[PDB]
């Protein structure tokens, strides 16, 4: 999601990418 | 054998000292299983010909100097020489 | 296919694996 400390593996393609806490 | 006794030591020791050390090692091998655990710190001295307190002297010496760059336990590459302070 | 090293390869002036050509 947000507040980048671990990445978000799960998303629709094209989103920048989280970078989630 | 003479060259190994002479120049194979960081601390050169007289050759007869090295031969006496080897004789002590032979005695310890001889009486290893004989006395059960390892023979008592006195009887192997009487096995020898010396005044028999020479055993602890010769055992105190023959400590080979440990490398200063030996990595300290559980970590690389923190080295032993880095922990020797200055007195 | 690479997120962050997309900058390192660029900075190192490393050419692409299969480069294009430009007339003189």
């Amino acid at each position: 999601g947000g507040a980048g400390h671990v990445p978000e593996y799960f998303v629709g393609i094209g989103t920048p990418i989280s970078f989630y806490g | 054998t003479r060259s190994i006794a002479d120049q194979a030591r960081t601390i050169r020791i007289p050759v007869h000292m090295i031969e006496t050390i080897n004789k002590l090692n032979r005695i310890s091998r001889q009486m290893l299983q004989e006395m059960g655990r390892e023979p008592t710190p006195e009887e192997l001295a009487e096995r020898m010909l010396m005044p028999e307190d020479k055993i602890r002297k010769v055992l105190k010496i023959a400590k080979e100097p440990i490398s200063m760059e030996t990595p300290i336990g559980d970590d690389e590459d923190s080295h032993l020489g880095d922990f020797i302070e200055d007195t | 296919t690479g997120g962050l090293p997309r900058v390192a390869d660029l900075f190192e002036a490393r050419r692409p694996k299969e480069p294009a050509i430009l007339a003189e």
Partner: protein, 51 residues
Amino acid sequence: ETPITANFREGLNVLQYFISTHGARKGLADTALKTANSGYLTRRLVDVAQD
């Protein structure tokens, strides 16, 4: 071929958690090693232009 149909408000079953574990491992490894690679890049960047 079968997206997760659960949320953390509900209770996930074995398959969904086992499949999410893949992405969790991938991303955590990316962080752990990319940080060192980024420090390496910072060092190269300071050395080229610091004077």
